[PDB]
Amino acid sequence: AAESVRVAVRCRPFNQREKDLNTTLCVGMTPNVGQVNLNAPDGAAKDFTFDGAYFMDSTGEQIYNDIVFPLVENVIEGYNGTVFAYGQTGSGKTFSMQGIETIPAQRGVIPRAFDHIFTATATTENVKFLVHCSYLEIYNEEVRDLLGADNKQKLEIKEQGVYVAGLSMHVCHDVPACKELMTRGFNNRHVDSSRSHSIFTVYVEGMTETGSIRMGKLNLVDLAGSERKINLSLSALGNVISALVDGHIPYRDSKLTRLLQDSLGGNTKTIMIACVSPSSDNYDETLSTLRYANRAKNIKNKPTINE
Ligand SMILES: Nc1ncnc2c1ncn2[C@@H]1O[C@H](COP(=O)(O)OP(=O)(O)O)[C@@H](O)[C@H]1O
Ligand SMILES: [Mg+2]
């Protein structure tokens, strides 16, 4: 079925220095209708409509429940699903994807997708599920396996769909197995993470009582900071989105757009979490993220059940 990319905006709270400077709040929201207003110094507001609008006190729990939970349900049924985190360095991309364990309601979409997948796969008595994970990093157009034996090894992108040749896949029989791969991946990151893209993939294979196998993959992507060969994957993402909404798509311009070409206009249900700052000192970057997120709503995907 024809389905548009769902876009949600998340505004982080002020940090300590912003409070010490008494920094002006230039972001407003009307979460019932997904409205985000951005105020300029002169007083003129710029208004945007999104599929979700999560303000300074929002939690990873309420973001997951409203926006990601139905996509993860679809992955279990056999669909491909992708969640990207987009925004400047310091806006909350990693806090939205990974989150924190010190405050349970602030746990990210990745730990939450693990709990959801292992709960839902066990409560479906008709289907037997096998879960596998992969975790890669793209820095300077160099693709690296974050869980492999040699993490330094640069890997090639080939097509059979599109895949990373030599990318290790790790069986996960439960949530602890999943969380060990997350910390393992973190300790193997390039030396900090602001200029690279990371992709955590969860493969959910379901075997029915008949014997029919369905295969849905979940891509959880933490993009490099959008602040204005290092910036090629980000520039190509913008160029791809422009072609997709402008009515040829240059997926091959970068490693990131080649790998995720099915997430942008292909067989996948995609969600974009655009992260913004509440501060008037970040106005220019926030306006850039909001315009990018607004444009991203017009991308048309064609997700079908992989069975
Ligand atoms: N919603 C939030 N609530 C509390 N702290 C947050 C929130 N979003 C981000 N932070 C804090 O802001 C800082 C930067 O966030 P981070 O996720 O690392 O951003 P990014 O990955 O986009 O560079 C961190 O110190 C993090 O704890
Ligand atoms: Mg980060």
Residue numbers in the entry: 1 to 160, 164 to 194, 202 to 238, 254 to 272, 276 to 335
What text comes from the article?
OSM‐3 belongs to the homodimeric kinesin‐2 subfamily and is the Caenorhabditis elegans homologue of human KIF17. Similar to KIF17, OSM‐3 is involved in intraflagellar transport in the distal part of the cilium, and both proteins are autoinhibited at the resting state.
The best crystal diffracted X‐rays up to 2.1 Å resolution and was used in the analysis presented below. Although ATP was included in the purification buffer, ADP was found in the OSM‐3 nucleotide‐binding site, as is common with purified kinesins. In addition, the L9 loop of ADP‐OSM‐3 is poorly ordered, with residues 195–201 unable to be built in the model, similar to, for example, the kinesin‐10 NOD but in contrast to the helical conformation found in other ADP‐kinesin structures. As this loop comprises the Switch 1 motif and is part of the nucleotide‐binding site, this observation agrees with a lower involvement of Switch 1 in the binding of ADP than of ATP. ADP and the associated Mg2+ ion are however tightly bound to OSM‐3, as reflected by their mean temperature factors (about 41 and 44 Å2, respectively) that are similar to that of the nearby P‐loop region (residues 86–96; 39 Å2), taken as a reference, but lower than that of the complete model (52 Å2). Another characteristic of ADP‐OSM‐3 is that the neck linker is docked onto the core motor domain, the ‘docked’ state being a feature of microtubule‐bound ATP‐kinesins. In OSM‐3, this residue (Asn334) interacts with Asn80 and Asn295, similarly to what is observed in kinesin‐1.
